[PDB]
Amino acid sequence: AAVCDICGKGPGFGKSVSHSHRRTSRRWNPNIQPVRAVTRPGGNKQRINACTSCIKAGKVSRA
């Protein structure tokens, strides 16, 4: 739950602000889920972490 193995999108770091205008540390992590990639026509897939961006763009096929 860190980075997409394909596009390598790492998490970004920022500062969270309360309604009292006081600052504090917080982190944002890109949406990535475990899916079996469709790359070989042979009909075999392997467990690889992927990101919604790559999945929806189809860089790893759906089948």
Add this chain to the structure above:
RNA sequence: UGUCAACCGAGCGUUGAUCCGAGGAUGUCCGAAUGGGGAAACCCGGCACGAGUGAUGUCGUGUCACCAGGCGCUGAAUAUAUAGGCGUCUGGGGGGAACGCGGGGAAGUGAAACAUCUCAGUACCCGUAGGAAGAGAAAACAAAAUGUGAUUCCGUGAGUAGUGGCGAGCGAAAGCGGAGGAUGGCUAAACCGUAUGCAUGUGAUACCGGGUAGGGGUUGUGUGUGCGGGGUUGUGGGACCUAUCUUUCCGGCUCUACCUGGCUGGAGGGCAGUGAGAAAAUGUUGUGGUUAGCGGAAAUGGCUUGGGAUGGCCUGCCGUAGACGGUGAGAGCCCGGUACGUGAAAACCCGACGUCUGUCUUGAUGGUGUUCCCGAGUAGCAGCGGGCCCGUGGAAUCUGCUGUGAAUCUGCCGGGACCACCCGGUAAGCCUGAAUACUUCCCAGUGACCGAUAGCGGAUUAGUACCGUGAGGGAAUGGUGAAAAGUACCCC
């Protein structure tokens, strides 16, 4: 025949010692440690080739990690195939004082308190290479001037325009003047060829510019990929037809033989070359400098005090050399050397002079109307955060994440919301030296800087003794005199 620091015994050298300059071998063990093991410098092996004993026991020289990337073989449950397994080559594991790039990232303290702020993007950490790095060829400014023309670094522009519990504080840009010259080059798209596959075929009147004609595969027609031409831009450009001008020879092809228009090979003549624009090697110069050395001028002058003249008085000489040190007391002419001249076996790097490599000349020049192209989850939009003076405020621009999601030249984006008219430009791919930053080391120089409680903690046994089981802390100790001639000898 190094040195602390005398002393003895031993020896070499004119047949060139010692010394210094360049290159070359050996180089026990640990230390990324990598034959295996482990509490640093200590224990135990395999394999091959040699040495030794009547044979084991023994001994010498090689070789015996891991990971990643190529290449070859092999193909499990399981069939296609993969994972996995073997053989062989190429690379990497650590260290380094400062200098860079991208991230993470704190608390003391001011506001006479303090949450926002500031301290500060500081200390520290992480991943990273170099001798420098990064950045870089406008989707840039400005405003009606017919302006500038890549980037970087300094001085102004000013403590102003702004911002802030409008407190404490924080802080630009444009333009202008300087250092440098390369206002440089590459790459995917529009279309033909070629190894292919996936396909399907009316498998025959379609593939080839016209005419004579032979046939049914340069597949008849589509798709994705590797390989060579033609193109690289803003007054838009590039691909197709249509006229004009056309600065070597020959061959094979445009299905085929014959004329017309195109594709490709073999030979002049230019073009550059270690180069960012393509890469590899091989044949002949600079008293270019550097790593040592060598030459190098003139008073034993006289008189005086003296232990000692390098002190005082009087006479000389050199000066392309009166910088600086030593010598028994302040030395141009005593010594070391200074001005100046020379000077290298080997090696270094620079520059210049020579085989070889490769694009183009099958090609270039100025026009025309039509059909296709100009960098995809991108630009923009909505939500949540950063840093620009802008501390969400009307919020421009850049950027991180999540959803939605566009077009190809009367297209698109920019001139601090936004609309209309004007003006500039062509992002979503990649390289690019010169102007700049720094010294752990070496060479040469300087001090209205310190002289032993000062000066680096360290002028001597120095990061030693010592303290602490640890990170770590951290001490004080120079002057005899010209030479030791360091007081023979006698006496208590």
Add this chain to the structure above:
RNA sequence: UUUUGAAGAAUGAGCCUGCGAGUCAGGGACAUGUCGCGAGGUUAACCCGGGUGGGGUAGCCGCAGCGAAAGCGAGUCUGAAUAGGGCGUAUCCACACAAGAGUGUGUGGUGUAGUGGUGUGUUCUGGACCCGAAGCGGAGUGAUCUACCCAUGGCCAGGGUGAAGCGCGGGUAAGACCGCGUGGAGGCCCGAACCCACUUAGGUUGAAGACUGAGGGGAUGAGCUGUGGGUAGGGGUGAAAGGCCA
């Protein structure tokens, strides 16, 4: 020294020789002397000179001010108002006009002085006269004593107390129960080593940075101890006292 008030019984001083304290940086600011120039002064960054010298007009202040502005100008803003007011035209004298509500309104003159270096007092930003804590964060180091647990050994001198069970003689129909011999279960009892620390006297510039002399509790267990291992600081551990962590 600090005190309104002290020779003090308010503090500092054993003696001696050394070491120890209003400086620096910036074209900063105000003020004050000093030198050139004079309606100008004035150079940065950067070039050429073993050298302090010579170039370098990019910049900054006075030269006109008023008004938030479109602007205007010896005037200007407020304003319906030459109608009074706010700011400015260096200052002055003289000449005329008004009231003499103190002064103002119009003409002519002498005519204005600022700017660069530098000495000195203060001030701005750097810790800015000298020295002086309890505490915070980041990064690292310790469970060899002390707490707990884990694997593996050793340790407890002597002497008493006698459950179940068992066999025999009684009781019963069988028992419970009644006596007789064996057994040593006991977080049982008295008492060594070891371990603990209750009272008491000494020590207190001690022999010892927490002991000694007399007495005091366990001693087969929640026992004692050796060997090697694990537990890291807003945390560990803790038969729980706000203890321990060299």
Add this chain to the structure above:
RNA sequence: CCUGCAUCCGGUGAAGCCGCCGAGUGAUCGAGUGGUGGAGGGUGUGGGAGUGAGAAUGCAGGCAUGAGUAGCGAUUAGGCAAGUGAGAACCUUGCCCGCCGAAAGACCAAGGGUUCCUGGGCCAGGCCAGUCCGCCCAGGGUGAGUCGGGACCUAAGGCGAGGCCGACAGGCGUAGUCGAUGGACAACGGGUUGAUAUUCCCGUACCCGUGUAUGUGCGUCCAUGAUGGUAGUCAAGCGAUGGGGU
């Protein structure tokens, strides 16, 4: 005090120190004189100061009183004759007396590294003097097929090829290899020098390996046998990285 400039002094004695004599309204001065010394100084006028001490329970070094006062670190206690030598209650020899004796004795592991022996001396140390020493100097000294460890095996635990997770840094744990306080494993008595002893010697034992010779002696090539009975295997001898006992 250091410096630019111009001057003067100095082995016929420059700088500090200790006196005498004097001098200015002050911080002081003397080119006026005496002893010590041996190597650089003064005046005039400019520029720059780490430029002037008595106190902060200041710091480095040296030294005052209490002071020739307390103590000289237990629960046993010495005495005598002789010797050595300059020195003897503290050293050597001999004779009495006392103390300890679940230790105040004889040993192992951990712990230190030359404290062990021989020879030399007694300015450093021993709480006093020392001929003595756990002071130092110079030399010498440590002997394993069988004792403790390694080459044999394992635990609580540590490392960790692959791998999982994690923004990076990093946390986990498989196969394996490390880790005695355990298991198995083969020697005892006596003698010996100034220091070594299950180690050397004497006497007698035990456990693994290699070579040669000899004797039992069995097969490969013949072939009986048992068979499942022509033919195909075979039970010799080794025997596990595997199974099962211990």
Add this chain to the structure above:
RNA sequence: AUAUCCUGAGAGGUGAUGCAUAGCCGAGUGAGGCGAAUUCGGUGAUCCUAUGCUGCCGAGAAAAGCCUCUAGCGAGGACAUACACGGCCCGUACCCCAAACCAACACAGGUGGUCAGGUAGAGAAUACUAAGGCGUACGAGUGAACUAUGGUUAAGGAACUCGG
């Protein structure tokens, strides 16, 4: 069935015509030579049989080695005797209930384990003692008070002290 096997204390023979010793001679920092008897009883273990046996519950390491089995290799190997050989690396002095270790010291503390004689004694307590080792590092004198550790004391016995 004391069948058969295993184990196995203790006893007995061998090791040993050897070694050592009480003692006798000369000989002294000491060495040399010679060298007797060595039978029977009592007491009695914390040591052996013993990983035994009997009770109890809180219910009690692994690997290696050894034996065996085949799988599998296999034509030389097994046994016995004799002769002649090899058997690897580190630890090895001295100090150990302390003047040599832990405590700043030549310290009134601590430090795991093994040896345990005689007499009285229940004893590994207590008293004197053998083997064995010590007189441990400032001394000599002196009826002061006072201090501290002991010893004794008429009659009352707790009347002091907050408190036997």
Add this chain to the structure above:
RNA sequence: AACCAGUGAGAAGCGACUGUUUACUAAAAACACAGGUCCGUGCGAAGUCGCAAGACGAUGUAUACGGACUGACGCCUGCCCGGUGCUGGAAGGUUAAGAGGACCCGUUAACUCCCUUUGGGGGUGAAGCGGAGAAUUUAAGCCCCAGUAAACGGCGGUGGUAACUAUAACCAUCCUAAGGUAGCGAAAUUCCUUGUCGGGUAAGUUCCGACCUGCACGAAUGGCGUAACGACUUCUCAACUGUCUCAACCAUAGACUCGGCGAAAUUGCACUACGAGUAAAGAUGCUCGUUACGCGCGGCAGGACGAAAAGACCCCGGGACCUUCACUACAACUUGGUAUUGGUGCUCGAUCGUAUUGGGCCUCUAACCUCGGACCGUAUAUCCGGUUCAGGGACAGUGCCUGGUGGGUA
């Protein structure tokens, strides 16, 4: 016969016993201890450490495990559900993000009047581009209603009503939830207190047994007893003794002289009297007066505000830790939307059949999930990966925004 070698009894209080604790002032009435009750846990559990895998719980499965209060054994364990938590009913009101676009304006196409010639100067209006943007939708929390005291908690005063004196020993007044059941009581609780009564010696503010006037005893922060036990606290009795009237004597190690070595704290100065005075209010050091040869040794300690640690007690200023309905945040938990995210069916609505795009429910498998079984990588593997079989399944988990609880942390 030396040495060695337990005083005993009678009560009360507290605790059931043996045990453990503040190294270095406190060993207890403190702590735990076996008994019980309640709460929570359906199994890669809850609870943990760890942002994650994973590990413990357990190589176990409610006749167990985690949390809480109590403490052997005997007789027992009263009333109250308003407030706050917890478990249920959310059947209504309220509101976040997101969907949604009533109306409005800016903008110039087109224009509405003069004014020219080739849309502005004095208002209408299309599209596109933008802005605030309203009504409708929502889920949680909050308000509403029941249960729970071995959950945190509370359990009063007021008046009247006996045969002579004594008071309430029944009824009603306010309130809320009721206004102390058993048991005990001048106690480890009691200020007025040495309360009153009986025991104890001559004397008893201690002690023992009772009296109820319980400021301010009380039954799971338990009450009253209780065999045995306690280096726990208080009192009484016999024996004893130098603890006393009342002290005396003897020995050891110092204290003392002699010999040797040789110590520390402090220190402004010194040929450092006293009586009465004088002052920063207590004088060796000042005024008047009295006394007093110089220098030592052994003894005693009133003074020299003697030595020790920049006073702990007080205040000022600044820290640290702690508590909560003080403020502001965070972790964690929890609610919806949205992406991951698929197909077919029933059922509810805003331009009784006609149009509305979002809710509720049931199904199917391919996404996805399972510390389920069997095989292979594999000689040794409870790791890991792959194939297959078997179950869940468009949920859950996880990204982004958001509403709530939140002394667990800052």
Add this chain to the structure above:
RNA sequence: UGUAAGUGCACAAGGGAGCUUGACUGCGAGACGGACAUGUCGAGCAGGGACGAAAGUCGGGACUAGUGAUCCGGCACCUCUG
């Protein structure tokens, strides 16, 4: 004699009656006391009003208490900017 006290008012500022909103706009010569900013009075000018024939008075209440800076923001208008 509205609201406490004092100072005043018998001429009125006590009461009664008719009309009317000067409880205006643009200004202000000078003084009052104050460390600072806050606080107090005022003659007189112009516009356009009120009362009164006129002379004349009116910039709230016989007098002294009935209140609050800075910053930020809202509303109307403006011959400012853009």
